Design a protein around this nucleic acid. Sequence first.
DNA 1: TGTCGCTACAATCGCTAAGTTCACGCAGTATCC
Length: 868
Amino acid sequence: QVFRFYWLDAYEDQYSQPGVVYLFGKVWIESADAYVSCCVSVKNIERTVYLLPRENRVQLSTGKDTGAPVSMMHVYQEFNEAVAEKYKIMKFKSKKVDKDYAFEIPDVPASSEYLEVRYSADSPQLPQDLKGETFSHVFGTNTSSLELFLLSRKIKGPSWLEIKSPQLSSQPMSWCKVEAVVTRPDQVSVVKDLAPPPVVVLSLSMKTVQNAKTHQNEIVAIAALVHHTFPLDKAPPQPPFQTHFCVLSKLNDCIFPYDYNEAVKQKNANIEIALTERTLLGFFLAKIHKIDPDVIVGHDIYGFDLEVLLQRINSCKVPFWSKIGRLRRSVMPKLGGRSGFAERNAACGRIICDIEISAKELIRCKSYHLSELVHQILKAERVVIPPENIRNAYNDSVHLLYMLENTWIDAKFILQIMCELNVLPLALQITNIAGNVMSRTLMGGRSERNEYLLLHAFTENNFIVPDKPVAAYAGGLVLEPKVGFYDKFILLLDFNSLYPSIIQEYNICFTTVHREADEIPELPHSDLEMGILPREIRKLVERRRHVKQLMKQPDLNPDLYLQYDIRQKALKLTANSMYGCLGFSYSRFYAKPLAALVTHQGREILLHTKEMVQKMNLEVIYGDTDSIMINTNCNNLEEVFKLGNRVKSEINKSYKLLEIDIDGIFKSLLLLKKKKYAALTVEPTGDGKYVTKQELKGLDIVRRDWCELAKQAGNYVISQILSDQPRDSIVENIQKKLTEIGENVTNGTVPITQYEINKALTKDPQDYPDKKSLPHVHVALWINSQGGRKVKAGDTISYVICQDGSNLSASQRAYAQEQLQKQENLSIDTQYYLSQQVHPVVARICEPIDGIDSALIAMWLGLDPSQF
DNA sequence: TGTCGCTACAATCGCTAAGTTCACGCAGTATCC
Ligand SMILES: Nc1nc2c(ncn2[C@H]2C[C@H](O)[C@@H](COP(=O)(O)OP(=O)(O)OP(=O)(O)O)O2)c(=O)[nH]1
Ligand SMILES: [Mg+2]
């Protein structure tokens, strides 16, 4: 009678169907000897409200205090007489429950007795501020059905579920293969210790041509790759894709090449040629229904792909739109709005993976557009078709097939990127840790993950969580650097998980720090037991430590090493976001006093460590909120390691959980400012042999907002300055290289790509006020003016500042590289680069350097020293 | 419709206020009527 399946996604409609949640997942059907998508509708999820009784009865209007003690019987009688009649509640089940509370609502005791009352989700929802003569507060009034279900059944991310006494649906309600109806939450249970089942992953790339007549993006091809046995707990398979299907349509007025049909037939691929976008969309929807993928992956899927698909479906009136998801509906949610919420609702039941968002979360790159990711991750070169060539493709079979194969290659690259970063396993792990839904986790962001983690933690410990909500404080202390150049051995000491460790050691929790509704609250007493937040953060820290230890294994595959590093960084960021959400104004658990206490303890710890190290007769030259840089004044590495171990042990002796570890040994350092230095990191190889690795932190050479020419010049200068050559030779080489770069720029021998400068966008180009015209924004608008895919918020834009004879400021002459290559009145402003891109960076680098100054750099670059 | 925290640096733009130059008065000498 039981029903075991692996649930992946959950969907709830607060307005359409009250008290109903649909769970989508995989179920093993023995006859087919494979998993089939199944949907389970958990109905009758009653809403629970906790009422806080008063100590004594109070008159409602007079605001008096009669003095009659208020018991649970009196509370129930009042709710049955006044409130039940007032708000038209017919049936409700009432019981007395002893629950805890420690959050930001005044006059609520830590532990007290409440009258839990439930009733159907069809009944009206009580107001959040409801009060009465016998009760002073009502909680959980705005509790969503999904949250109630997840917290009641203790479901934490994807996992196997067992359903008792399943029912059959009267009529089909989902596009899946198996359906089942659960009459109550209590009939659903969780079964642990079972491997996740392989899922279907569909990677799709589409090419569109915009109609300037209506500024509508019309789809002309969809190249899609599918793998039916993609694992969620193992390494990506090779080859990453099993089979594929291609669909290619024509425009409204253009026609196919002469012998397109014969060439397509000879190609032997699964090419299905749809005459019109309507037939193409119908075929795509039928294919999606047949495959029924569980994880649809793409690039800009949430921003461009799904939005265009749904808009064209609506325009062409493709009958069964709801097949894009897994539920059966008739009315499409209104498009637009912020975020991909419309897209997510449209694709309900399918986990949408946007490798753009995932790449932004996982790695750091100068640009996040597909070509840059392909070059950086896969180390391949991507051929880009200009939109004019896409329009002109309808003139020969060869070019049309080239366009289709380019779409196919883009889809393959998207799948390869998804597999390389290991996005799906990491999403599963983080979802299990947090306990939210996987689609939200893959949508990005840290607030929901930590919020659901703390929801699960507090709920399981008999606590009433706060109702969902419908530089504030000081931070870390940065030591004043001893700016200069150091040629001896510098020993770096860095704390491990400093803020998690502070939370653990000092027992900082909602139930331990007695706040008061900007003074740092008192530390908790050492008598109290460990709180919920220390326990959760300790679990996170232990998981990260386990991953790091697993990384230390010798002879590891470099790809597996990078995957482990990414996972460790993700866990570190998860813990740091758990800390940060305490100081998030819109968070469910906004506890600014707790964050202030944590930061104050961090500052105190750093100050104490600095004082201890200085009291040890050692030199301290830098430190950023958890770290210290020490000038050993030694040239032997063994003594450096010995002293480092001694000082690390001495510092660790004063703490119970906080530990200090030797971060690295720098043979040479260039301390310029706060958060700006370059060093030759030393990694010992053995038998007294060590390898020197360069390391730049915060310099302009490691920033995407500078031209690659300036970055190259600064890198060469830093390499020379950090070398062991005599100073005179270093200065001579710097002069020679600067003269060479000046000659190259003056003679136009530099490659054009070295002039690009990248600046990201915060809002849409339209939403930027008319604050003159910020360079990138300027170019951004041009890109939107031109006939190409628009540029939205959070998109990098590479522009080249060029001469136009305008006698205007540089910031108002920013242009795209294609603009320069096209227009005959635009030329690269050589003087601008030589004076404001190369000179500033090298001058900043060489500030503490003897023999080099701004005037000398200008002279070597061929500029006029006068102004400098 | 959501949206982790804070600290630091750097370029750009607007504002604006001190600093500067250029021009108006007085005194003297001189030339030229
Ligand atoms: N909220 C938040 N806090 C951060 C972030 N990055 C760093 N911090 C805080 C918490 C860290 O413990 C502290 C020191 O930074 P670290 O990069 O050395 O990380 P941490 O010491 O926690 O761990 P680790 O040294 O990598 O083992 O600064 C962040 O992105 N968000
Ligand atoms: Mg650290």
